[PDB]
Amino acid sequence: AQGTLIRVTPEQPTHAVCVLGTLTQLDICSSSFSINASPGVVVDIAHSTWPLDPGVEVTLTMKAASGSTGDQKVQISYYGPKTPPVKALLYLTAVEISLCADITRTGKVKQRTWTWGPCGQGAILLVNCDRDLDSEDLQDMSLMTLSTKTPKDFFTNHTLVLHVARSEMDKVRVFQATRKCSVVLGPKWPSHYLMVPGGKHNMDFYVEALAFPDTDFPGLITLTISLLDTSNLELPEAVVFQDSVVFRVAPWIMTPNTQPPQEVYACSLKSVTTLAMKAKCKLTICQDEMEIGYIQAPHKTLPVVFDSDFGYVTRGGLDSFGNLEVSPPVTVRGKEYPLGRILFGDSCYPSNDSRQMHQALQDFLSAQQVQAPVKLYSDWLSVGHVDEFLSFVPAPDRKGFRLLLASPRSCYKLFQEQQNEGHGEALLFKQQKIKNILSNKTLREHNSFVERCIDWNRELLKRELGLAESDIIDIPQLFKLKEFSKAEAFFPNMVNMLVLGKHLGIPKPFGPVINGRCCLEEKVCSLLEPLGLQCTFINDCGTNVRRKPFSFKWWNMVP
Amino acid sequence: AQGTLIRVTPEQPTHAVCVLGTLTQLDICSSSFSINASPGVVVDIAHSTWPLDPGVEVTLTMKAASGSTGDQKVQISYYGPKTPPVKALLYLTAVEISLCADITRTGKVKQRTWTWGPCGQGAILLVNCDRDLDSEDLQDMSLMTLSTKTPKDFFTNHTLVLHVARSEMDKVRVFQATRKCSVVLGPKWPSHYLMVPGGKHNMDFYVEALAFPDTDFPGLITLTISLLDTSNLELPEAVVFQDSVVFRVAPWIMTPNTQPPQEVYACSLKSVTTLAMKAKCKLTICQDEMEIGYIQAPHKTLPVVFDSDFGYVTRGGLDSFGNLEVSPPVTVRGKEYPLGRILFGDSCYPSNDSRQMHQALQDFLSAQQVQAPVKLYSDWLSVGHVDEFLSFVPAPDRKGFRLLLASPRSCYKLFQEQQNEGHGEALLFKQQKIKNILSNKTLREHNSFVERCIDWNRELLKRELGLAESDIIDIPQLFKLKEFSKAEAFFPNMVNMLVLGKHLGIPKPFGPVINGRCCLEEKVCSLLEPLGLQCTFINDCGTNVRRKPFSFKWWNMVP
């Protein structure tokens, strides 16, 4: 354990407290000898032994909490040459003081650093999310309990103070449970005196975080209990024993397309309701600027919405949440990413004309540390969203997903195959013929340049997510460089789909019709249906989706 | 290695660059086969083989830089059923592009993350320190070189851009070496086009940091070289190959009392010059608000002064640098602290009346990460400095230092021993007698309370620095609670000494004189002289000391 040094002097007896669980050592030389003590003081001693060397270690531990004070005694016998000399006397009071929380993330309150992992230790705190007391409101918060056993007469001479560092007080709030709840630690004040009675007592506190992690806040918060001696009245108080819990604020975590859908939201059409009904998920009608994630603690998980029983954050077009996706769980040269890995789009290098997501957003995602964001290249698109060039769908096999990427190649091939077979005369959507498209040398060279960009991202997503080609799947799709040599879809972007859990809501290309059936619509299906997916096409997109949070407990990650 | 995917099509030949050191893969299926190519393209291939499965991997690597473009060729032969069909053609240009720095901290420019340790990789940058171009000023800065070998005709169709993230541009500055130096990356602009000629070239840049680490800056800075295709003129530029170096800004590091003294400074007495002369260190006369540390890179170390060839920082009485010490190198339950471990004083818990060092200072020391500050308790002293209760001296044995702590006990004993031997009538410095001091029950209880405080710190310094009692040494010293029950020295604080490398400049107590020799002066010497120390006493302290920076290279630590 850790703790104190008691000095013993034949002049006058000493008095002292020993907190259970600590290591009380004893300074004899500062004044052969022998040691004798009450039955409940175990006096183990190394090199008992008799000598008077200061390298003699003497440690006392008490077996139990005292009933009075001086209940336990310790007699040290000074002797040698040819003399009786002194017996030095020492009067110990034993107390039990446990500041204790849920340090094993298991919903149950039972080494003073927070460590990640399945065999780590640390309580977890939820930030408080609310737009605009008893148990009616504390189910959400984190329970922490002081427990004490001390002799009835004890707190006339000692008091307990609970505190936080001035540097964390704004990021936390502690409530005290009288058996009303009132604030006792917080952004206003860092300490508080406890009115604890002698004998066997224990009091409950309730903690809430007020700040997600961020560049200026790793997300650790420490609350400490100090036991002070106030026995001498003129002297100030002396601290006898500090002990603490370290809490970690739960990060905001995003949910991938591979997670079962729980609910869809849309604004003021009736094709997404048909979709929801086959998907097994609920539909409520009352905007794609806000992303629905979650926070999670052993005792509570709670959906939290990231705008710009629902929580709410507002930190702050590449600089929007449509430029924000998450990979599904993936493993990458060993390192495991159980909660997926956040993808968001920017440029390659930075320039007079480069756009980017706002730095304060990027930073906030990084600090959330458990979905190590990856930067993709999307600045080549007029709009800028990574969703314009990728998507994720559930598979029932290899890894249990497929990365769909947009593929101008896969469209050229498809239209070329059509011509061969004899349908060069078919109308896409001006309304241009499937051939005039193939001949168009300015289109070609555009989709060539787009091809380079998507391919650049293919290779990042191959690297950063550990993907193999067997994980990817090219969906046929054309683009056009209009505004500023930036790209836009040459026909409805199919890869911008609503992945409603195995039931896909894809934008209908009004692609060239063969056997009374659109070739793109059709090729898309020979790619997806074998996987178990159920493609459906819609005409154009003001939809968010709440998905089931991962079983995996974020704190069991090891970033 | 890492890198690209080339698609081959029997319609028209393909052209491409391959940068030396990267992994170029080849998409055949997107259109049995056989592969044949120029002598300098090694075409290794797994499961050569003949099939037309897409799970066939084909990788090309070039042996050397091209002389022209299309110097190397690759022919892919499509065949099977009962047919000759197509040979698809591919024309490769090989270039060499190495952005490279001193990634092995060895003064010599020769995996794109900075890793700590004796077998880690990462260049190191010095922040620029200056109150108020060629080699005359670049010795201090960090050399980074682009080297290229490409065919003479190469940069008509490609250009190179050097860049930093917009989020690091303010923290760095890069200078370009024309063979004048001019800023090319910095707080103003994040990118720059390089005017590099085809053929064998290499250019030098010089980097400097402009920011020590701190809560908003882990201290990593990344510079990247991008190679862009500008061959099609209407299309925008496409990135072909990014590569980078990650630099780490060198922290500000403090020097303990155990480090050989190099120079003393004092303000406008002649006892510290006698001291300097026995110490072997220099003395210059022109204030204890500023602390002299150092920054260090393989190529340069440079003393830097921390006020509030000399660098200069000014981040911003517990809240001063007299409240700032460093432990000597120590090892603590395994974890090794080669550069010592910074001690600074504050309170126990925080209160209406607690003082503390300013949070922005604390944070800055922590971010400097390599001397993991420890918080001590000094708020119990009127003034507040940890130097009032401790010091460090060189020893020639166990660990090679001793922690001296103030000890009211050790003074009582010493005065008591004197009385016994018969000198209760001796005058300290009112002028009180050595006995009236012993009888004084208000003094006693004061030094009792001080004893608790120093003892609290004994145990922290035992814990956090891994000290044993055999490392500590009590120097006799009395205190008095005056102003606010806060403490001050009852007689000149001996433990507040000038450790000038084995030659100690201690404040003379005008302690009770025995055999014409002050007992304290004398006891102090029976504690220190056996260790090899040479105590000298002075009357009162406007002195700083520059000490030799540690041999150990901070970056070989592993925090």
Curated annotation (Swiss-Prot), chains A, B:
Its cofactor is Ca(2+). GO terms for biological process: chromatin organization; chromatin remodeling; innate immune response; nucleosome assembly; post-translational protein modification; protein modification process; stem cell population maintenance. It is found in: Cytoplasm; Nucleus; Cytoplasmic granule. Optimum pH is 6.5-9.0. Ca(2+) 2 binds at residues 130, 132, 140, 309. The keyword Calcium applies. Ca(2+) 1 binds at residues 128, 130, 132, 137, 140. Binds 5 Ca(2+) ions per subunit. Its EC number is 3.5.3.15. Strongly Inhibited by F-amidine and N-alpha-benzoyl-N5-(2-chloro-1-iminoethyl)-L-ornithine amide (Cl-amidine). These inhibitors are however not specific to PADI4 and also inhibit other members of the family. Incorporation of a carboxylate ortho to the backbone amide of Cl-amidine results in inhibitors with increased specificity for PADI4: N-alpha-(2-carboxyl)benzoyl-N(5)-(2-fluoro-1-iminoethyl)-L-ornithine amide (o-F-amidine) and N-alpha-(2-carboxyl)benzoyl-N(5)-(2-chloro-1-iminoethyl)-L-ornithine amide (o-Cl-amidine). The keyword Magnesium does not apply. GO terms for molecular function: calcium ion binding; histone arginine deiminase activity; histone H3R17 arginine deiminase activity; histone H3R2 arginine deiminase activity; histone H3R26 arginine deiminase activity; histone H3R8 arginine deiminase activity; identical protein binding; protein-arginine deiminase activity. The active site is at 288, 385, 387, 541. Belongs to the protein arginine deiminase family. This is Protein-arginine deiminase type-4. It comes from Homo sapiens.
